[PDB]
Structure 1
Amino acid sequence: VKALYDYEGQTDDELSFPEGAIIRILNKENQDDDGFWEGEFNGRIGVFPSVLVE
């Protein structure tokens, strides 16, 4: 997926990325239904709000 706006992660396990970035999706639909997805970018893996992508 391509990142529409740049994001900066709050926690340790959140995925910081710049705008336009191509990210490889890793999962969806958490245990709690929270809207966050998981993916890899620049050799760092984490979670991000799914509303910021494609």
Structure 2
Amino acid sequence: ASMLPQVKALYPYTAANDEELSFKVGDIITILEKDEGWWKGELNGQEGWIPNNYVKEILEHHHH
């Protein structure tokens, strides 16, 4: 398997069209693909574009 990038929403977002993904603050979104300022997210079995400046990538700096 591969570990995909995951991000945590900093602010909520309402999708502007069917191809975007809405989310609330704190949501943990999996990233399937990147296109400059928009990332393709997956959350609760739904997939759509999200603005990357609404979220913060979760990085593991250290072994647990």
Secondary structure of 1:51 counterpart:
helix
Matches within 5 A, 1:1-54: 1-29=7-35, 33=36, 35-54=37-56
- Over the aligned positions, Cα root-mean-square deviation in angstroms equals 0.9
In the superposition, the TM-score normalised over structure 1's length comes to 0.85
Structure 2: gaps of 5 or more residues: 1-6, 57-64
Aligned residue pair count: 50
State the identity %. 52
1 or 2, which has the higher strand percentage?
2
Q: Which amino acid aligns with 1:8?
A: T
Q: Give the whole-Å Cα distance in 2 for the aligned partners of 1:42 and 1:8.
A: 16
In the superposition, the TM-score normalised over structure 2's length comes to 0.73
Please tell me whether Structure 1 or Structure 2 has the larger radius of gyration of its CA atoms: 2
Runs of 4+ residues deviating >4 angstroms: none
CA shift, 1:39, in A, is 1.1
Q: Which amino acid aligns with 1:22?
A: I
